[PDB]
Subunit: 104 residues, 4 copies
């Protein structure tokens, strides 16, 4: 049990230290920026209430997927297709990072 906590602590330190790498920071900011753009687009173009635009943006960008909503306009549909690849590009970025930071 004490080992659990010590391991947990060492791992948490390593996670917080990751928030120090400038490339991880960029990816993070880019992600926030992407989530904000999505929130703006869906509230504007699809008329979704702000909190629902972020929710759709989050579930869509993370590949979780929305359970009922889907863009109603052709403009929304196109944006979403593009939004999704941006999301995949970001994930690969993080993955590429975790791939380099491990092989150094």
């Amino acid at each position: 049990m004490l080992s659990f906590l010590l391991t947990l602590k060492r791992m948490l330190r390593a996670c917080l230290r990751a928030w120090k790498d400038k490339e991880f920071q960029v990816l993070f900011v880019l992600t926030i920026l992407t989530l904000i753009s999505g929130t703006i687009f869906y509230s504007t173009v699809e008329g979704l209430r702000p909190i629902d635009a972020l929710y759709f943006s989050v579930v869509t960008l993370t590949t979780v997927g929305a359970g009922n909503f889907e863009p109603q306009t052709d403009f929304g549909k196109i944006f979403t297709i593009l939004y999704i690849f941006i999301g995949i590009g970001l994930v690969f970025g993080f993955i590429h990072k975790l791939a380099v930071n491990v092989q150094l």
Copy 2:
């Protein structure tokens, strides 16, 4: 095929070997903890039966996605958003582990 059988067993041994690594155990406990918290949160704030709160918690945390349900309250939606990122955080954790154990 004995050959096939032997390969499976070797793999299974390597799997159970991971369930011994402390870091993997932490990650595992944390996801169960996360699943429980989720099950609790959705039972309370969204008022789902426990089994349906666990289900939504699972399909949501793993990025599988629910086919019909989605948080009705603002609290539920905000929680779900953070929940998903915890899930991503956890998966990166397991992945980093799998990329550290290869070396």
Copy 3:
């Protein structure tokens, strides 16, 4: 253009050669076995038409997600939760493999 095809060919050979690794074979068989069990369970317990039980099994095991259907019984719900982790375990398996076969 000729390079495209040559690269494409070399990559395809490498993919087919992967179908030779006994561990990849096991993971593959395990996956088929898992998809068959799912197809049987959902058709039986949830009364889904066979082709729909496989479809749900596939979209669920791959994290794609079903757009409308979800287990109606508590038995189905429990099985699905477990089904999902089996699926994640298999994915990590493949990933672990692609991680070793690259660092040899």
Copy 4:
């Protein structure tokens, strides 16, 4: 922050550098090809407008998932199942690439 700006630019350079690797180009062409085929298949067999066939093709091939639609015909369902595995096959491809370029 110039520092932040410089980091971004370095990363962007490394991204465009990948769009030069032949193997990555193949993988990319193959997914576009796959997306087109999907868009075509769902337009015909399921009778969706092209933009809705592309959308379902995308959300399906990336594992994001559609919130309401799903193939109505048996042909559509069988195709979708194989489509998803092509998608998994493609992602493993990009991943293997990202794990070969690290070394």
